[PDB]
Amino acid sequence: CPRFLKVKNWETEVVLTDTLHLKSTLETGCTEYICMGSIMHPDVATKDQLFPLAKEFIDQYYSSIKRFGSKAHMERLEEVNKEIDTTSTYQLKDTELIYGAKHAWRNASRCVGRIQWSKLQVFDARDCTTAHGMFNYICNHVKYATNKGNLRSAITIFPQRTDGKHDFRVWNSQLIRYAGYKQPDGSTLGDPANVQFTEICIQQGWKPPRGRFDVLPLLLQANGNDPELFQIPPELVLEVPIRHPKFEWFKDLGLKWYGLPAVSNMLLEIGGLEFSACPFSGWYMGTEIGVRDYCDNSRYNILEEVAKKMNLDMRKTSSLWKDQALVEINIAVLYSFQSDKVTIVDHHSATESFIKHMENEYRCRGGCPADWVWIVPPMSGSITPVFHQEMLNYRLTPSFEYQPDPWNTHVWK
Amino acid sequence: RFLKVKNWETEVVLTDTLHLKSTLETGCTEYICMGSIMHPATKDQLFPLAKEFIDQYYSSIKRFGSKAHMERLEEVNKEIDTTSTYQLKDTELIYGAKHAWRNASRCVGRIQWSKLQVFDARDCTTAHGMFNYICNHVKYATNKGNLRSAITIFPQRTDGKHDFRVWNSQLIRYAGYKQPDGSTLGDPANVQFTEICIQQGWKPPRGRFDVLPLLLQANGNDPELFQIPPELVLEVPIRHPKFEWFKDLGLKWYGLPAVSNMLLEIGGLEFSACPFSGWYMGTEIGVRDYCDNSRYNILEEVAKKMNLDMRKTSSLWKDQALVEINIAVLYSFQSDKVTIVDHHSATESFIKHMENEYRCRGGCPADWVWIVPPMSGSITPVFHQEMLNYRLTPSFEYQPDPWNTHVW
Ligand code: HEM
Ligand code: HEM
Ligand SMILES: Cc1cc(N)nc(CCc2c(F)ccc(CCCN(C)C)c2F)c1
Ligand SMILES: Cc1cc(N)nc(CCc2c(F)ccc(CCCN(C)C)c2F)c1
Ligand SMILES: C[C@H](O)[C@H](O)[C@H]1CNc2nc(N)[nH]c(=O)c2N1
Ligand SMILES: C[C@H](O)[C@H](O)[C@H]1CNc2nc(N)[nH]c(=O)c2N1
Numbered sequence: 001c002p003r004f005l006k007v008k009n010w011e012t013e014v015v016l017t018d019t020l021h022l023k024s025t026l027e028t029g030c031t032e033y034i035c036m037g038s039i040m041h042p043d044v045a046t047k048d049q050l051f052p053l054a055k056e057f058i059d060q061y062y063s064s065i066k067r068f069g070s071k072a073h074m075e076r077l078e079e080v081n082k083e084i085d086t087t088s089t090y091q092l093k094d095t096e097l098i099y100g101a102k103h104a105w106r107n108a109s110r111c112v113g114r115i116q117w118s119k120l121q122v123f124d125a126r127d128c129t130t131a132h133g134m135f136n137y138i139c140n141h142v143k144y145a146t147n148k149g150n151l152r153s154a155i156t157i158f159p160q161r162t163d164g165k166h167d168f169r170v171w172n173s174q175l176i177r178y179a180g181y182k183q184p185d186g187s188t189l190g191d192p193a194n195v196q197f198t199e200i201c202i203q204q205g206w207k208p209p210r211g212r213f214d215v216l217p218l219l220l221q222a223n224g225n226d227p228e229l230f231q232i233p234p235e236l237v238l239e240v241p242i243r244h245p246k247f248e249w250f251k252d253l254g255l256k257w258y259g260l261p262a263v264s265n266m267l268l269e270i271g272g273l274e275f276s277a278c279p280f281s282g283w284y285m286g287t288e289i290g291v292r293d294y295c296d297n298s299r300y301n302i303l304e305e306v307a308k309k310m311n312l313d314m315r316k317t318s319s320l321w322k323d324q325a326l327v328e329i330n331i332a333v334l335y336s337f338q339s340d341k342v343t344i345v346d347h348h349s350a351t352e353s354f355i356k357h358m359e360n361e362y363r364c365r366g367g368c369p370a371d372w373v374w375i376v377p378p379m380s381g382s383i384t385p386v387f388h389q390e391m392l393n394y395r396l397t398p399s400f401e402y403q404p405d406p407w408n409t410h411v412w413k
Numbered sequence: 414r415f416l417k418v419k420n421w422e423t424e425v426v427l428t429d430t431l432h433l434k435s436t437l438e439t440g441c442t443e444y445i446c447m448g449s450i451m452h453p454a455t456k457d458q459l460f461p462l463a464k465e466f467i468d469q470y471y472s473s474i475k476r477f478g479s480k481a482h483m484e485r486l487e488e489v490n491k492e493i494d495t496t497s498t499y500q501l502k503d504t505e506l507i508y509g510a511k512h513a514w515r516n517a518s519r520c521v522g523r524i525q526w527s528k529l530q531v532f533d534a535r536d537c538t539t540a541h542g543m544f545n546y547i548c549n550h551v552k553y554a555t556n557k558g559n560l561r562s563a564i565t566i567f568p569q570r571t572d573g574k575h576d577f578r579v580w581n582s583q584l585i586r587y588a589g590y591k592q593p594d595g596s597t598l599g600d601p602a603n604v605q606f607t608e609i610c611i612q613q614g615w616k617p618p619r620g621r622f623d624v625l626p627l628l629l630q631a632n633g634n635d636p637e638l639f640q641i642p643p644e645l646v647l648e649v650p651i652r653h654p655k656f657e658w659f660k661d662l663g664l665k666w667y668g669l670p671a672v673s674n675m676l677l678e679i680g681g682l683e684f685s686a687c688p689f690s691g692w693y694m695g696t697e698i699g700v701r702d703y704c705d706n707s708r709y710n711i712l713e714e715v716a717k718k719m720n721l722d723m724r725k726t727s728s729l730w731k732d733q734a735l736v737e738i739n740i741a742v743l744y745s746f747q748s749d750k751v752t753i754v755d756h757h758s759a760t761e762s763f764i765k766h767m768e769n770e771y772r773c774r775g776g777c778p779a780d781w782v783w784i785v786p787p788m789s790g791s792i793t794p795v796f797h798q799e800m801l802n803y804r805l806t807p808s809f810e811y812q813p814d815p816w817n818t819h820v821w
């Protein structure tokens with residue numbers, strides 16, 4: 001690989017130089033002859049696999065605190081090596097855990113919100129042993145991160161994987177999501193993205209209200225045991241009813257959304273250790289709700305009803321009735337969150353912040369891996385500055401990774 | 414290995430085998446993806462490239478290994494020997510030009526690829542000849558508004574000192590003028606090219622929509638200026654179907670999009686002058702040409718006339734104005750019966766095209782970064798379509814601007 005790589009911004013002519021790609025660890029999926037940049041997704045570590053992975057992370061940590069090569073650095077290396085020898089695994093210090101989690105966010109090429117990466121509140125839940133205890137930790141996470149609408153980014157980290165038969169898992173894909181119910185006639189009530197998980201909950205004992213916006217229960221697995229159901233206390237679930245500053249009829253659509261986006265199905269990898277339950281939360285970019293959740297055809301799919309109430313001609317695509325309604329929906333989402341004082345960022349502000357963040361990372365870190373396909377927002381892409389910014393994508397560790405859905409792998413007791 | 418692509422909206426899965434036929438590089442490696450980077454012979458090298466292309470041509474007409482196939486291979490071999498190059502048959506030129514379009518991973522309009530009028534201009538020797546060929550192209554492709562796809566192919570490169578080049582980036586474009594007070598009148602994308610035309614003698618009208626002259630280089634000589642006859646240049650005044658004040662913005666655009674700075678590569682031969690044209694997708698004018706900060710940059714003016722609150726980004730005033738501008742563009746072209754396609758229809762056609770190509774050909778190289786439209790991405794079907802990008806030949810390639818290589 002070449003030592004310096006240049007990226008250009010085609011609207012400002014700014015050229016940045018990346019050297020950080022030389023620390024790339026895992027594979028992108030691309031080759032010299034094919035690029036998999038738009039592919040959405042392109043039994044443990046042995047003692048011998050673990051040694052070099054831990055040393056790499058420990059070296060990186062001691063370099064970050066300006067103590068590389070120090071007595072404490074060499075001592076930590078030796079203590080980790082011994083621990084891997086006698087137990088075939090090792091435990092992270094609290095300092096290392098916090099550094100690792102922050103950097104997994106810093107390295108997340110698909111995240112436009114990373115200017116905030118260093119202000120992550122890390123909750124250490126490695127002492128947790130039961131699903132009730134997981135429920136307690138998650139309730140505390142939700143209450144802290146919500147903060148009455150002044151949202152704060154946070155992560156809660158449950159015990160790492162050991163032999164793969166004792167995984168901690170949150171079976172929910174996000175901590176707060178709405179149920180979906182398939183009907184005998186083929187229609188769907190609620191959120192069509194969550195139909196599979198809803199059916200699982202119902203099979204596990206959940207009594208479904210069968211409404212349009214039913215907060216799903218938590219389904220929590222500790223130490224490889226069968227998962228258990230818990231209802232989040234509704235006073236902890238902050239929600240925003242959606243209304244429009246101009247269209248009085250918009251509130252009559254009965255739409256609302258939850259304030260806290262909190263991913264709970266990813267895997268956090270630090271120094272070769274695997275934290276399979278590590279729910280993390282931030283705050284929304286408006287388009288995640290107003291474009292994807294609401295206007296995706298396989299989601300709530302409200303473009304038609306909004307367009308009807310806007311009295312647009314919906315017979316010709318070239319009237320751009322979809323585009324016109326999509327903007328108003330996103331105007332309403334941003335207006336409703338700001339009116340209720342719940343943190344939210346519009347796509348113009350977020351992408352301008354990300355450009356400033358990326359320039360700082362190139363200057364102070366030597367690069368910033370970024371996945372253009374994910375960074376550019378799903379509406380008005382080219383009137384945001386990220387559209388014109390060349391990006392390099394590569395995988396640094398620590399990182400957040402996808403993992404198989406737990407119902408596909410769990411050995412029922 | 415067989416590679417699968419999934420559409421996440423329809424859950425349709427396609428299987429790609431065609432990528433096994435590529436050997437040009439993408440720029441990516443196993444460790445770094447450059448998918449959002451815009452730009453990442455001899456007798457010795459020529460014959461294998463020639464043979465590959467002849468092979469796929471005779472394989473395409475189902476006479477692979479025929480006597481005609483055998484004879485052409487040896488004919489081409491003797492010619493690369495005795496002349497250091499070779500000349501394509503007419504049938505081969507047409508096939509190679511259609512397939513360069515079919516292979517253009519960044520083009521959402523490829524459902525049309527085999528409806529392409531190919532104009533053979535390989536006997537051209539002077540800039541006057543190029544001008545005549547180009548005027549004929551423009552008149553044919555414009556067709557009084559019923560636009561027809563076309564390409565004109567000038568003589569191939571020989572030693573690199575005798576290149577044919579269209580110095581314009583598109584056949585029809587608007588001049589851009591650096592103002593004394595610091596700003597820009599016209600189109601800022603073209604400020605440099607406009608200055609070169611003035612430096613070469615063109616008398617600029619210093620307006621907002623001044624059609625640039627053609628600047629044409631033949632056989633490596635200095636380029637020459639030519640005015641396209643105005644009756645050949647079809648233009649559309651932009652008005653809005655509800656905002657009657659929109660026409661008072663004074664906006665217009667040309668109907669014929671015609672790229673003239675790329676390089677066409679067929680069987681290892683390089684055609685440095687190959688202007689090709691089709692018809693517009695509305696967002697090309699309404700989103701990029703009008704609203705890029707480094708282009709005409711009219712969002713502020715439009716949002717003014719709509720009386721939108723412009724103090725905070727979160728009112729989405731930019732997004733509102735953007736949609737109205739794009740409604741006006743489509744409405745104006747359609748009212749004047751000038752061919753144009755909206756991004757919803759275009760991307761729908763491209764998904765259908767992908768389906769056709771997977772069935773009959775085993776895949777379709779496609780660049781998601783370029784295929785997805787610059788507005789309303791995820792409400793178009795391409796947003797949810799996984800795509801494999803790879804380089805098949807014949808192809809269109811970028812080349813350096815001639816004013817950085819030419820010696821006068
Ligand atoms: C603080 C405000 C934040 C904002 C505005 C934000 C914004 C976003 C957005 C818009 C996406 C694309 C989401 C999608 O289309 O599904 C994304 C992806 C992602 N974010 Fe952030 N995020 C924030 C906080 C966080 C935090 C705290 C973490 C982890 C510590 C994080 C990690 C990620 C990851 C891993 C992805 C990619 C996951 C995937 O591949 O699906 N984000 N973010
Ligand atoms: C017939 C109607 C056509 C439509 C609607 C169409 C649409 C488009 C659009 C919207 C783009 C992106 C352009 C940009 O963002 O600057 C594009 C790219 C491209 N088109 Fe098509 N196109 C058409 C015809 C053609 C023809 C006839 C050719 C060649 C014979 C062609 C070759 C290309 C190439 C090579 C690119 C990629 C350019 C690059 O790499 O920068 N297109 N097309
Ligand atoms: C922490 C946070 C901030 C924010 N603004 N939005 C979210 C929800 C969107 C989102 C992510 F960001 C990251 C990951 C997922 C889930 C991965 C799903 N993959 C397979 C499409 C996600 F759905 C989370
Ligand atoms: C044939 C045709 C149909 C259509 N719809 N639009 C156009 C103009 C846009 C366009 C292209 F398509 C292809 C290439 C360029 C040149 C882009 C500049 N390079 C340096 C990125 C272009 F600017 C041409
Ligand atoms: C940096 C990035 O590659 C660049 O802005 C690309 C992105 N996608 C694009 N897509 C199209 N259709 N046209 C473009 O000019 C671009 N520009
Ligand atoms: C096929 C394609 O990769 C898929 O639709 C991706 C595109 N980009 C995205 N970008 C974001 N932010 N979120 C997404 O879910 C997707 N989906």
Ligand SMILES: [Zn+2]
Binds near residue numbers: 030441446
């Ligand atoms: Zn790639």
